[PDB]
Design an enzyme around this catalytic site. Sequence first.
Site, PDB file in Angstrom:
ATOM      1  N   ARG A  61     -12.492  -4.570 -31.055  1.00  0.00           N
ATOM      2  CA  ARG A  61     -12.848  -5.484 -29.949  1.00  0.00           C
ATOM      3  C   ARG A  61     -13.631  -6.668 -30.494  1.00  0.00           C
ATOM      4  O   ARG A  61     -14.628  -6.501 -31.217  1.00  0.00           O
ATOM      5  CB  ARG A  61     -13.618  -4.759 -28.808  1.00  0.00           C
ATOM      6  CG  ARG A  61     -13.913  -5.619 -27.522  1.00  0.00           C
ATOM      7  CD  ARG A  61     -14.643  -4.760 -26.432  1.00  0.00           C
ATOM      8  NE  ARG A  61     -15.047  -5.600 -25.294  1.00  0.00           N
ATOM      9  CZ  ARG A  61     -14.257  -5.875 -24.247  1.00  0.00           C
ATOM     10  NH1 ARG A  61     -13.034  -5.328 -24.154  1.00  0.00           N
ATOM     11  NH2 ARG A  61     -14.692  -6.664 -23.264  1.00  0.00           N
ATOM     12  N   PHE A  66     -19.866 -13.909 -28.865  1.00  0.00           N
ATOM     13  CA  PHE A  66     -20.599 -12.806 -28.264  1.00  0.00           C
ATOM     14  C   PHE A  66     -20.852 -11.684 -29.279  1.00  0.00           C
ATOM     15  O   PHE A  66     -22.027 -11.397 -29.654  1.00  0.00           O
ATOM     16  CB  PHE A  66     -19.852 -12.318 -27.007  1.00  0.00           C
ATOM     17  CG  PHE A  66     -20.517 -11.182 -26.302  1.00  0.00           C
ATOM     18  CD1 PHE A  66     -21.910 -11.088 -26.230  1.00  0.00           C
ATOM     19  CD2 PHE A  66     -19.756 -10.217 -25.644  1.00  0.00           C
ATOM     20  CE1 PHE A  66     -22.522 -10.040 -25.543  1.00  0.00           C
ATOM     21  CE2 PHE A  66     -20.360  -9.154 -24.984  1.00  0.00           C
ATOM     22  CZ  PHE A  66     -21.750  -9.076 -24.914  1.00  0.00           C
ATOM     23  N   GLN A  69     -16.939  -5.485 -32.435  1.00  0.00           N
ATOM     24  CA  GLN A  69     -17.173  -4.060 -32.162  1.00  0.00           C
ATOM     25  C   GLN A  69     -16.262  -3.184 -32.957  1.00  0.00           C
ATOM     26  O   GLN A  69     -15.078  -3.474 -33.044  1.00  0.00           O
ATOM     27  CB  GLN A  69     -17.001  -3.730 -30.670  1.00  0.00           C
ATOM     28  CG  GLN A  69     -17.071  -2.199 -30.329  1.00  0.00           C
ATOM     29  CD  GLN A  69     -17.292  -1.933 -28.831  1.00  0.00           C
ATOM     30  OE1 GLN A  69     -17.695  -2.830 -28.101  1.00  0.00           O
ATOM     31  NE2 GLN A  69     -17.002  -0.706 -28.370  1.00  0.00           N
ATOM     32  N   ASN A 108     -21.631   1.761 -25.877  1.00  0.00           N
ATOM     33  CA  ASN A 108     -21.731   2.965 -25.050  1.00  0.00           C
ATOM     34  C   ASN A 108     -20.881   2.815 -23.783  1.00  0.00           C
ATOM     35  O   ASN A 108     -20.284   1.738 -23.553  1.00  0.00           O
ATOM     36  CB  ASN A 108     -23.210   3.319 -24.761  1.00  0.00           C
ATOM     37  CG  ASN A 108     -23.902   2.322 -23.869  1.00  0.00           C
ATOM     38  OD1 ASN A 108     -23.388   1.966 -22.823  1.00  0.00           O
ATOM     39  ND2 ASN A 108     -25.097   1.872 -24.273  1.00  0.00           N
ATOM     40  N   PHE A 119     -21.699  -2.417 -32.272  1.00  0.00           N
ATOM     41  CA  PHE A 119     -21.214  -3.769 -32.247  1.00  0.00           C
ATOM     42  C   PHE A 119     -22.264  -4.620 -32.946  1.00  0.00           C
ATOM     43  O   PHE A 119     -23.434  -4.190 -33.070  1.00  0.00           O
ATOM     44  CB  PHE A 119     -20.946  -4.273 -30.810  1.00  0.00           C
ATOM     45  CG  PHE A 119     -22.167  -4.222 -29.888  1.00  0.00           C
ATOM     46  CD1 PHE A 119     -22.895  -5.387 -29.626  1.00  0.00           C
ATOM     47  CD2 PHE A 119     -22.569  -3.011 -29.285  1.00  0.00           C
ATOM     48  CE1 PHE A 119     -24.002  -5.377 -28.753  1.00  0.00           C
ATOM     49  CE2 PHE A 119     -23.674  -2.967 -28.424  1.00  0.00           C
ATOM     50  CZ  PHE A 119     -24.399  -4.172 -28.145  1.00  0.00           C
ATOM     51  N   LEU A 128     -28.320  -7.514 -22.483  1.00  0.00           N
ATOM     52  CA  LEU A 128     -28.042  -6.153 -23.031  1.00  0.00           C
ATOM     53  C   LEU A 128     -29.324  -5.318 -23.313  1.00  0.00           C
ATOM     54  O   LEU A 128     -29.242  -4.134 -23.629  1.00  0.00           O
ATOM     55  CB  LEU A 128     -27.141  -6.228 -24.288  1.00  0.00           C
ATOM     56  CG  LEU A 128     -25.784  -6.968 -24.141  1.00  0.00           C
ATOM     57  CD1 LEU A 128     -24.969  -6.934 -25.473  1.00  0.00           C
ATOM     58  CD2 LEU A 128     -25.005  -6.314 -23.034  1.00  0.00           C
ATOM     59  N   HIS A 132     -28.159  -1.218 -24.487  1.00  0.00           N
ATOM     60  CA  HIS A 132     -27.645  -0.807 -25.788  1.00  0.00           C
ATOM     61  C   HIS A 132     -28.798  -0.709 -26.747  1.00  0.00           C
ATOM     62  O   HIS A 132     -29.644  -1.622 -26.797  1.00  0.00           O
ATOM     63  CB  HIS A 132     -26.634  -1.831 -26.298  1.00  0.00           C
ATOM     64  CG  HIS A 132     -25.438  -1.935 -25.416  1.00  0.00           C
ATOM     65  ND1 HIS A 132     -24.394  -1.041 -25.496  1.00  0.00           N
ATOM     66  CD2 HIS A 132     -25.184  -2.727 -24.348  1.00  0.00           C
ATOM     67  CE1 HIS A 132     -23.509  -1.325 -24.550  1.00  0.00           C
ATOM     68  NE2 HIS A 132     -23.963  -2.349 -23.844  1.00  0.00           N
TER      69      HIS A 132
END
Length: 172
Positions: A61, A66, A69, A108, A119, A128, A132
């Site tokens: 991903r 951003f 991952q 998660n 990530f 976040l 996370h």
Amino acid sequence: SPQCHFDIEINREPVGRIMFQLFSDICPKTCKNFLCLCSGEKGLGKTTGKKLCYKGSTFHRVVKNFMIQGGDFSEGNGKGGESIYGGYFKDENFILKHDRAFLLSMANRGKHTNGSQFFITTKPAPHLDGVHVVFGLVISGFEVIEQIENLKTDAASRPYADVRVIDCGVLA
């Protein structure tokens, strides 16, 4: 502070080494998991039956500006992976914030669902915080991150190219 590395190939072209510094003071359980996944020393996953190791895993991903991952060693698509503890483990703490680029943080699917997926952010991501667990920082290989981050992805943000952790390990 323990250190560990990934060596990356994109479509079988070697593109460099990502070096991580882990903050095992603040997040000892989370860093031990990540370290053991780099050495592969813990053997087969208890719920997955796949080797607890990042070697041969992908980045599945990618979101430009951003994060990138990876760590889904059992399914390669975001549905898999697990921790060295067997399945998932609790959010250790949320002391460290996503206050900068190149932080390493646990992927998660809700509270207490930390497995093997992680990530790396490429910008501050304060929304976040408390979601996370941040446990580490990239200290070398920024150009590799950039390169991965700029790959063409499909609608599900999955890169079309093969982004492969060809080697990884714990440093002395």
